[PDB]
Design a protein around this ligand. Structure first.
Ligand code: 1GH
Ligand code: 1GH
Lengths: 118, 118
């Protein structure tokens, strides 16, 4: 059972809003389907797949207990990409651009996490 | 009880080696002493403090079970910095530079994690 916090609210309504509509977002909006994309050994290499669609649903459904967990899912999504792919690949450059934006927005997130009731 | 893996070995001998000696590394090599630095409410805002000294010791002492845990400690260190400080602060620009290097190196880490025995 997760909860609503000021930081999670910010991650939803400011961070995810900036990322979801970005030019480079579309390949990250749903899980990597390795077989359709012809990606060998994707599930040997990546044991914790993650994508922005899953994160967005989790934010919408109060899945997270704390913003740190949501930020961990973002980090996992980006590092999965960096690990599976080559440093010069289009998808890695796209991920780097998205992560730069994510981290920039995190620098203006509310500082002290407090739960919101109603 | 942690273990030695090819990825943790890479994080130690390649990633931490590149970061530890960087021009901007020195403020990150030990925990943030908020009172000496005159940083109000540091421990209200940051509930999971982390630094490269602690990570380096953990790598040296086989504290981690998997590279994902070490990468999470790096991410926590950087996002702690971004959260406590302002987007334009010297320390945040320094952290961003270090994180760029960290993530660049992660893109060449061994892909499939396998434990090393002896
Ligand atoms: C080449 O990387 C991808 C390409 C994708 C994709 C997800 C990834 C992806 C992501 C994201 N993280 O690891 C991988 C692998 N999801 C959908 C999708 N649809 C689609 O046409 N692609 C191609 C192959 C693509 C898109 C962008 C950049 C490079 N290649 C892709
Ligand atoms: C202004 O930020 C810091 C300054 C530090 C520091 C750690 C931080 C720090 C870190 C790293 N993450 O959050 C904070 C706060 N550790 C040691 C240390 N010794 C030292 O003289 N400083 C000053 C205030 C400094 C250094 C670099 C950039 C800006 N300000 C610092």
């Amino acid at each position: 059972p997760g909860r609503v916090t000021n930081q999670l609210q910010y991650l939803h309504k400011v961070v995810m809003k900036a990322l979801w509509k970005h030019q480079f977002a579309w390949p990250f909006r749903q899980p990597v389907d390795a077989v359709k994309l012809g990606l060998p050994d994707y599930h040997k290499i990546i044991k914790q797949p993650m994508d922005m669609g899953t994160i967005k649903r989790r934010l919408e459904n109060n899945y997270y207990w704390a913003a740190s967990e949501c930020m961990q899912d973002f980090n996992t999504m980006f590092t999965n990409c960096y690990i599976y792919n080559k440093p010069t690949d289009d998808i890695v450059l796209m991920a780097q651009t998205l992560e730069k934006i994510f981290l920039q927005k995190v620098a203006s997130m509310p500082q002290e996490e407090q739960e919101l009731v109603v």
